[PDB]
């Protein structure tokens, strides 16, 4: 029992972190096999970031300008290329600590762990969700660029995020491991609109199921609702509309607790319309949307 | 910017986890140098747990009864001893992945990361506080016993907790790495009173400082208070009385923000007396007490 915002064990990812320096800029790189991946803005000075011409800035750089240090040791760079917003530095040595890995583009509303790093050194690990508007509300400071987000399925690390930027609003933006930004962002020091965000309804329902499993049940009521009725309330409260695909992924939690998904929707409806009345659910005084149904099952069954 | 409940990177601790089996019971062990530490209740059956005579139960066990497996490989047990509520199994091989480490007994109100494990395999990492009543509100299931809590100071892991038990209230109890329980608990299947808990005042103030640093400042007011006046409010709201030692550790945060500690106390006083009025601070709708002043400084400066 108990339910926490749990991150994946970060060890497999710590073994891949390196520091990449190009000129006066230092950030984090991810060393997998014989390639180091890092944000392409490592080639910019502060002056360049207002409107960088990355193709031109990269043409002035040679393999020997990219200083890659794996803690104690220096890596020899034998190739460089830009793919979207990431640089790929081919090194002459495959990382001996490379775990089994995949590069995946996650969907908005999915969660992942972030290993925040500075100068190629891991500082901390936290779990977060990719917001429906493709931003993440992380904890990142200058030098954290190149820190990665990931999930783990037994021995396989699926890398889904590389940190690039903090928006003027204090929220975070980055790319998949092929250098494609999540959302409409560009790697430039320009104010950029993040879309209207929404609350991840299916995650809130999964978390209400986690609450019932762990003994917090005051919010259960004698009511039920329909997808249509629930979606009118979801609309009013800026929640994602619930679909049958979301109901389907909540099936295991509905089966484990015996609480039909639409009955849990009626509890969520009442919580939206009435608030918490000064009470808490799993130590929170608000509706939590950073746990997916898979996260709740994994945490509630003890998956390693 | 941004502020998250960040755990330490767990890699150094993942390399120490092993599975320990004695008869029909399997739990986690911590392998450091040539010793494996685990909860002594690994020697009990379910029948034994109602009132175990650990000295007698351990006398029926030999070195060969303790099956220790470090993932793939079996460790050869050449000695066993009980120290308080932990067993120490001497193995013939020093763990090659042993990090620089210390065993420390943490104070109530201090925080640490937990690497939750099952069958010697890490499942997740989360940050938590040792409650003033010496319980922890973790996320643990059957098989998690032997999972450890720790802090890291550059390359040194200070192990402070080993999980033993879930109280009938769903909260967690365990020991330091010398097998001494935190709090009044005993390793027996008996209902046990955890003391009256309190909110960790110095941590809430540190978190209010983290909020101001990260832009959440609506709660700042035109008031100040005294330690005596603040402590009357702390008393009413079941918060730990604030002392000069707590004011002193908040000095760096007071200096960084220019907000005197007693002025932050007056904001906390108003929040206690009025609530949040439906607003949030750092994404929370309640007053958070799981960040120490050191945690806030570390997170807000980017320490690796
Ligand atoms: C200072 C900071 C804090 C947190 N995360 C990231 C940062 N750094 C930046 O945002 C630098 C930067 C500026 C403009 C475009 C790009 Br791409 C990168
Ligand atoms: C089932 C579970 C869940 C979470 N953490 C721990 C557990 N396991 C236990 O508490 C088993 C146990 C029973 C009585 C005394 C002692 Br010492 C240990």
Curated annotation (Swiss-Prot), chains A, B:
There is a cross-link at residues 5, 90 (Glycyl lysine isopeptide (Lys-Gly) (interchain with G-Cter in ubiquitin)). Changing residue 132 to H: In strain: Omicron/BA.1, Omicron/BA.2, Omicron/BA.2.12.1, Omicron/BA.2.75, Omicron/BA.4, Omicron/BA.5, Omicron/BQ.1.1, Omicron/XBB.1.5, Omicron/EG.5.1. The gene is rep. Cleaves the C-terminus of replicase polyprotein at 11 sites. Recognizes substrates containing the core sequence [ILMVF]-Q-|-[SGACN]. Cleaves and inactivates human TRMT1, preventing tRNA guanine(26)-dimethylation of tRNAs. May cleave human NLRP1 in lung epithelial cells, thereby activating the NLRP1 inflammasome pathway. May cleave human GSDMD, triggering alternative GSDME-mediated epithelial cell death upon activation of the NLRP1 inflammasome, which may enhance the release interleukins 1B, 6, 16 and 18. Also able to bind an ADP-ribose-1''-phosphate (ADRP). Changing residue 205 to V: In strain: Zeta/P.2. It comes from Severe acute respiratory syndrome coronavirus 2 (2019-nCoV). This is 3C-like proteinase nsp5. Coiled coil: none annotated. 3CL-PRO exists as monomer and homodimer. Only the homodimer shows catalytic activity. Interacts with host FBXO22; this interaction promotes the proteasomal degradation of nsp5. The active site is at 41 (for 3cl-pro activity), 145 (nucleophile). The chain holds residues 3264 to 3567 of 7096 of the full protein. Inhibited by pyridone-containing alpha-ketoamides compounds 13a and 13b. In turn, alpha-ketoamide 13b (tert-butyl (1-((S)-1-(((S)-4-(benzylamino)-3,4-dioxo-1-((S)-2-oxopyrrolidin-3-yl)butan-2-yl)amino)-3-cyclopropyl-1-oxopropan-2-yl)-2-oxo-1,2-dihydropyridin-3-yl)carbamate) inhibits SARS-CoV-2 replication in human lung cells. Inhibited ex vivo by michael acceptor inhibitor N3. Inhibited ex vivo by compound 11a and 11b. Residues 1-304 form the Peptidase C30 domain. Residues 1-304 are cytoplasmic. Signal peptide: none annotated. It is found in: Host cytoplasm; Host Golgi apparatus; Host nucleus. It catalyses: TSAVLQ-|-SGFRK-NH2 and SGVTFQ-|-GKFKK the two peptides corresponding to the two self-cleavage sites of the SARS 3C-like proteinase are the two most reactive peptide substrates. The enzyme exhibits a strong preference for substrates containing Gln at P1 position and Leu at P2 position.
